Amino acid sequence: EIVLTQSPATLSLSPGERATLSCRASQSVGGYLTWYQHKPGQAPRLLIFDASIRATGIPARFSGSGSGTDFTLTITRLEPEDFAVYYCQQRSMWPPVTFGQGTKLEIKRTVAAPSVFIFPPSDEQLKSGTASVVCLLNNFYPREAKVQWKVDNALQSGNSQESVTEQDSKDSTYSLSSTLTLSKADYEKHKVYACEVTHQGLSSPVTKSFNRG
């Protein structure tokens, strides 16, 4: 069964620049290979099939090259409409029809450090027996960030969940939401609730905290 490996996983680039995406098959599918474009909430879009040929409506900034095992997709002069996810798909040996895990073409921007906010649980929630502490990381670039919850100096792990927005159409920023969840009984026996953020726009970790009370 053929396995496509795409690189890089995520490509950060600026418009006007050249983007080069690779797709390695585990075994010559040779000519045979498509490339697809995918924007969130949208239907995939065929770009070029049989490796080098663009379908109709697809721009010239897009060219496919390659054979058997190694393939490349070059978007030679980036428009903002291309930042999407790109997938390669094989069709020499199927089923099954395989895909790579996609490459995400994202926008390079300058480093923007996160504005951090911590939010205590509402009294209303605490009556139902649970407590949600929320830490917001607002409009930062790049995307990689690190949230570390601390309760009374103890590092928490396994009791948080996180979510990141799509890159802003206007800013090219990302924001992240982290929720630390604990029982009400636990929330009440502790005091210091802190959110430690590590990001490349900071010389050192930022910590927002509050004391219950």
Add this chain to the structure above:
Amino acid sequence: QVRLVESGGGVVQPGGSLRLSCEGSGFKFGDHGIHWVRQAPGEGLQWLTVISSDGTDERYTDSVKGRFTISRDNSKNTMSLQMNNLRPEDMGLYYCARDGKYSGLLDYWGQGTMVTVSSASFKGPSVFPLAPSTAALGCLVKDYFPEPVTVSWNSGALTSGVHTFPAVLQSSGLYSLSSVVTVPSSSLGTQTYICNVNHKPSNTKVDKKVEP
């Protein structure tokens, strides 16, 4: 004006079944074969099945082999896939994609219908406040099932500095999400901020006022 429209998706319990459907348009449809490809959350694309363009060959991938059966009826421009004994590996977005004039070429795709496999019962959200002390404030839309929910701020009038996050699935099997907005700290005791939450799956509406 090639259109592939999926229908049928929904919620189901593990071990249950659904019947999906794909209606074609702007093209002569028995002519091409039809594919189902699915996209689970935080995941890529994986192929599942194709039915030739006449009625005769039907391929499946190892994994739905036994559990899934595909079909069509060109005189109607549909095609359909019955999925049985559904598991939570089956959960995701299902696209029907056309095949090239076996091409193995999905040349036009649909947007997809959503399949949810959960033993969780429908439930409307508890909406909590994320109170401010520029400031940040929001609403915590918690313990709802299933997706989705929409959030507005001040009935559509607060649109700037609004970040509504993707929901997260907790162990309860209930979802949880956040919607924040950044505003001027000078507006806090002056301007009212209300998040409008709409969870259509449960016929539930909540407006939550958030103050300091």
